[PDB]
Design a protein around this ligand. Structure first.
Ligand SMILES: O=C(O)c1ccc2nc(-c3cc(Cl)cc(Cl)c3)oc2c1
Lengths: 115, 115, 115, 115
């Protein structure tokens, strides 16, 4: 129910080995760690959560763009790319969070389907 | 060897039924029709060409964004989104041309892999 | 003068007017301390946030209230807000423009840093 | 005054300086007639392309010479050029800014139309 896809605009390739941390807002308004993982050779990160566990809430998907670029030897601008959204508030949906990275810019979009 | 993927930034969905025309620059410098098709329910267009037919050359992938938005009843800014590039000049590659559409904006990127 | 925020609307092809923007500075304890705020003008710009003396090196977060923007236009948006988190570095150029391009299910951001 | 082009560099976080830009008007026979051209300034902007009297309704193409830009910086780019093709419509607002954000394998463009 939650997938992350990351592309590299400098290389024209998937962004491989990008760390991604997902948080969910708790009742006390703090960000609780929810799931994390790394993008594969295809730039995709599957297996973050399950439909049972991915309940309604406000989620933050933090894509660790600085760590990605630094591991490539590049000094980038941003610390991370964040995507913050309410999920599953009209029932379960499947969400793909996609991002396109450059050293001084990024883009993100959501692809949401109803099973 | 050539796939096109189109996403809709207003709907948060694949862009379905987007017409795409591919041209290849001829020896006389005109744009020759090369292949065409429509995106599926997943926003993807497969089957445009073959590795035999997709020789070296300068290609133009024209994504018919105005026709897409007009079919949704929206008056958009652009006539189309174009992506013009040299392909297969260091041997065969597989190209994905991706685009993200809004009524007054679009983004495009390339994902290129070597089989 | 050292920091400007510019916000554009990809749906209407216009500046994003009267958008609330909050800037925070990361404190030593990793919390986000309020730093400056305002609303974008008719040109989508927010000037006068800080001065050279106040804008020291460090990590800053620019939060753009995209949800209220879209709702005021009668549009249901995906994101709670847009975030741009970056490091200010004195060894680079001296004026930072943080630009954002908004759609309901997507946003893009870039840095335009000049002397 | 009715038409301005602004070009930004997503790799360096800067304006895209000294980029050649050619504007064409679609003729009655569907060919592209030269209309105006220039090179972007230190701010990434190209002003003075046309006047109100000259800029009539019709379809225009703005070609940005991204390939030369990247090569002058020592970077191998994907695209031959970037294109932005749109209709000028008198029933909408009166000043058009065509903005482009460049990366080696990707570009984004938006319209900022104001009165
Ligand atoms: O090849 C695929 O399956 C695949 C999937 C998701 C994708 N998301 C994009 C995408 C995202 C942004 Cl934010 C801007 C642009 Cl231009 C493109 O391209 C994708 C390609």
């Amino acid at each position: 129910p939650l997938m992350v896809k990351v592309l590299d605009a400098v290389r024209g390739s998937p962004a491989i080995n990008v760390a991604v941390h997902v948080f969910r807002k708790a009742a006390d308004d703090t960000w609780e760690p929810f799931a994390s993982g790394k993008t594969s050779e295809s730039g995709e990160l599957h297996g973050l959560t399950t439909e049972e566990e991915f309940v309604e809430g406000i989620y933050k998907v933090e894509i660790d763009t600085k760590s990605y670029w630094k591991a490539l030897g590049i000094s980038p601008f941003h610390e991370h790319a964040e995507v913050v959204f309410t999920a599953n508030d009209s029932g379960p949906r499947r969400y793909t969070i996609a991002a396109l990275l450059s050293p001084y810019s990024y883009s993100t979009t959501a692809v949401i389907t109803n099973p």
